Amino acid sequence: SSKAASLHWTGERVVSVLLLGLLPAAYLNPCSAMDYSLAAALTLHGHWGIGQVVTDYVRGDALQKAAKAGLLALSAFTFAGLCYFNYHDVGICKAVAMLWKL
Amino acid sequence: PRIKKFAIYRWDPDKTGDKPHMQTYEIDLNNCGPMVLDALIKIKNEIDSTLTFRRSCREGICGSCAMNINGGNTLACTRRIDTNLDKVSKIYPLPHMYVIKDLVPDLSNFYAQYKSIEPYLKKKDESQEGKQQYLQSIEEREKLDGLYECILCACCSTSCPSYWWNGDKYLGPAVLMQAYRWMIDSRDDFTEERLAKLQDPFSLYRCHTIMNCTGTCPKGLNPGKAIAEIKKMMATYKE
Amino acid sequence: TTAKEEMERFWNKNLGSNRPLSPHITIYRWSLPMAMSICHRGTGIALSAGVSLFGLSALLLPGNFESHLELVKSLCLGPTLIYTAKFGIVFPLMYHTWNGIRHLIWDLGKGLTIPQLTQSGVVVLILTVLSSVGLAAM
Amino acid sequence: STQYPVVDHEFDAVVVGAGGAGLRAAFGLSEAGFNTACVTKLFPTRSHTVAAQGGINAALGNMEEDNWRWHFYDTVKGSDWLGDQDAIHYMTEQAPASVVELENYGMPFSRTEDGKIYQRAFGGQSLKFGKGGQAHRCCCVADRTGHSLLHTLYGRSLRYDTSYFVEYFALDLLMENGECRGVIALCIEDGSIHRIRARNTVVATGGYGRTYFSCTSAHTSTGDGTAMVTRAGLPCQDLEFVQFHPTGIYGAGCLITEGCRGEGGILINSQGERFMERYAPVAKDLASRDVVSRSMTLEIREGRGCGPEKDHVYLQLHHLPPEQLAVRLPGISETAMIFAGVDVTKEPIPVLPTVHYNMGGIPTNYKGQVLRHVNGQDQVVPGLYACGEAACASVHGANRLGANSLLDLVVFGRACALSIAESCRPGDKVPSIKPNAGEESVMNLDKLRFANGTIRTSELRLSMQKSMQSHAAVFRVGSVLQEGCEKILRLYGDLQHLKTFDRGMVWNTDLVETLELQNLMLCALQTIYGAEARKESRGAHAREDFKERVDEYDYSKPIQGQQKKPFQEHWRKHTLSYVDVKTGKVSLEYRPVIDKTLNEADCATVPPAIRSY
Ligand SMILES: *Cc1cc2c(cc1C)nc1c(=O)[nH]c(=O)nc-1n2C[C@H](O)[C@H](O)[C@H](O)COP(=O)(O)OP(=O)(O)OC[C@H]1O[C@@H](n2cnc3c(N)ncnc32)[C@H](O)[C@@H]1O
């Protein structure tokens, strides 16, 4: 009797306290390292969040497995795109800053 | 002569081509008891004896007369009729449940879930049982207060939206609370394997603390609280 | 008859019959905590859709971020109207952030009674407006 | 005919009843390796033992030092010497054993300082054989003993491969030539009729409290097995003996436990005087179920009514500390406010003596075997057992001692299990049922399903209820009993004038409540006729005219040169009632009480004496 289901729940809350910790930390300390950590925690937590909606709502055999596959593709693209934005562009912390004073 | 209007859900499976509809009844409160069930029986006895419903104690300790009164899952023998004659009282069967007839739902799945959690005292050594009472201190007993009272009305589980959408695989708060009840019982030795029984995404983990179960409870119990307490144990238990 | 057997036979008799589903959402009463549950899902989905649309367009749409802003600068926007777009971004974010703590306080076990559910309910609701208006002017 | 699909089932044993006794008999059998089937019209939890509050009696010695034989004396005294002392021996010996079992089963009994089961004072119990003050042996789950009982019995029953027929209304006994072969029952779910045959049949269908207009018992206390036994032509014991619980809400008639009086609660008339100190000097308001309620109902006659109607009495919990009321009695604390609109800690509860328990029922062994009376002699009915409030082993006799029935349930439910297990074997031949078996059980169903009567079912239920409520109250004269008898007799003729409306197979509460009306009437006839016939004041049966306690001897003066009285002259005997179903007449005979115990050396007989608390 493995306990993957329980640990999954713990991860969800550990990334939630991490994400809550990162928003003020991104304000007080905007840097390249913060941009990557904010892209990593942001995409992971969102992935697990939507994952919960799919399991709650989508009733089906090859229906639930398909949506979970499509979500992983969407998240992997989202995280890599954010990483690309951090490396070859301004980066979230210096991007939001520009967007706001406008 | 104070006349009250009752809008009640009606369906006859023994009539062909019949589908869910609403039938209204009129009753004087001077001859009727204070409670909704008193009125339910009154129209059952005097007006229409097709109205088929569950009842027993009329005391609030069976969970027989469990139904959705005015958009709220409570007992009909505990809820008193709104004396306000301007409002029409809407009485419905317990939500998202297969209606057998006229406010009577199929609870057999709900019951089956109660069997799956195994609500009996389990000991590692059942060889010395039946001869001497198990010791339990008043503190160890206090832990069961607010849990053992669950009368299994099933107002609870079927007021949880998550239970409507996941009726088969999600156990529902009523069933879940009792699984907890048997965990903190200082006598029960099987606490770990009872937690290991919930190690899938559906069993307990379709809870998102909606908290619509507690507050509809006709006994003032707090299933939600106990569910969150299960979750804590689920991470803080070793092996 | 086992516990697993009873469920399997439950679904067989009911799905192969003319028994209707008792009205659920059609009739049930509305409560603030449950409305605040729906909103948390609504804001959660909308936010993730924003982040995804931001990350994907960084791969799919040509140009750099500075050129994308000069594209919005040349759109004749007044302070009151740019405040409206600024508000409708923080408004869902702040809701989910504050209510997020309310969910996290719940997971610890604290404040799970009906009074504390409606108390923290209004407190989150007010904190949202104060931080949404308070941020959109920075 | 053939409109109804007949479906025959095959088992080792059938138990009719999912409340307490029924359950303990059901899984008690399956534990012994029996292919057992349980049949119940309610769901197990919804049964009426859930409505129990007070407790479950066992001399565990968990408060003071105790003896189970002191529990024997108090039960046999309370029974007004109409109790069969052999069964009482058996029940009081198994008392601590059966309760320890339940605590091991999972019953979350309230706890003491020592860490043991919580026992409390209750009406009619004593120490040192009634010579050493009040006894504290009522084991309880803090005001919700019955609830917790029924649940932990059911929760434990899932362990065994018992076939439960949930929501099935048992119609009649599948009888063939003296011996029983099982039960024929209606499936409320889809209207079908099922014949369930077995080698044995346990009956635990509970009381028949709904014979009266006002009762503490649930709507589904219709004494169905009592009628089932009655329609087979088998006698029914002590049916006129009906327990009136002293305390119950003036309104709907819900029970406020006697555990209130055991914790320190007092009864108050219009003056403020503790009147239960005037009637019973020694035991006070902790006396018998019959003595207390009769004192209460007499105080109403005297003009000491308490409410705006001058027809009810008071139960005060105001003076007790709130600390105790929260921990010890929270179930009544809520239901007093819920129904009567009364805060327990500030003002007293309006109470009225109303029907509670039915000590009468199906004549039963100490082993649980159902008894027929032929040639003035006891005889065992093959393949038929009964246990609980439903049955009458008369361990309660003429007046049930408080908090004994939940014991009676467990012990005698268990008894039927061991009496089957230790007699026949599992896998033994199931007797072949008739091809026609129970034609008129169906011919009864079809008659009532299409009923085109001139008088409604519901109004006839009230016609029976109010008639019993006035003609057979706490006090009853031969005047009101004779008129009441020929009044109930007419209301049996009206059973072919009743109108039904619902004509559906699936869930016909119109049909089953009418089937309950056929069952309640058979109980009613046997209750009222036995009452007018019995001319004495024994226990709950108190004649205003024949106010004497008529025994074989006059037990006031010592038995010396006193001559014994013949059997058909004294009234210390069991009332056996028969009823011809067509004519609706009750003919009744009598049978001796058991006076001897099981073992005189270990537990000695206590002979009749002056009975007052
Ligand atoms: C009325 C009452 C009694 C009571 C009490 C409180 C109230 C309101 N509190 C008690 C207490 O605190 N301590 C105690 O010792 N006794 C107390 N009592 C008395 C006691 O509870 C009853 O004597 C006892 O509950 C009776 O139990 P029993 O095992 O005899 O069965 P039941 O609980 O009444 O349940 C009835 C079962 O029979 C089945 N049934 C009935 N008719 C049919 C038909 N037609 N077909 C199939 N099944 C039938 C029901 O399904 C039910 O399971």
Ligand code: HEM
């Ligand atoms: C820093 C503030 C945030 C905190 C503290 C936080 C934490 C949480 C918590 C505790 C939940 C509860 C899950 C549940 O049991 O229902 C949740 C739900 C969710 N969150 Fe966040 N989150 C934050 C911001 C975000 C962001 C920025 C996103 C994505 C852009 C997001 C997306 C989601 C989604 C999709 C759900 C699931 C909705 C549901 O099924 O109920 N959240 N979050």
Ligand SMILES: CC(C)Oc1cccc(NC(=O)c2ccccc2C(=O)O)c1
């Ligand atoms: C009373 C009714 C109208 O109200 C409704 C209607 C539809 C959905 C819901 N609520 C959810 O579906 C929901 C919301 C947030 C988190 C999880 C869930 C869930 O599916 O369990 C409530």
Ligand code: SF4
């Ligand atoms: S916990 Fe409350 S709402 Fe849930 S089944 Fe039990 S009594 Fe009903």
Ligand code: F3S
């Ligand atoms: S209504 Fe719900 S999802 Fe959990 S907190 Fe209650 S069971």
Ligand code: FES
């Ligand atoms: S009938 Fe028992 S709770 Fe309503």
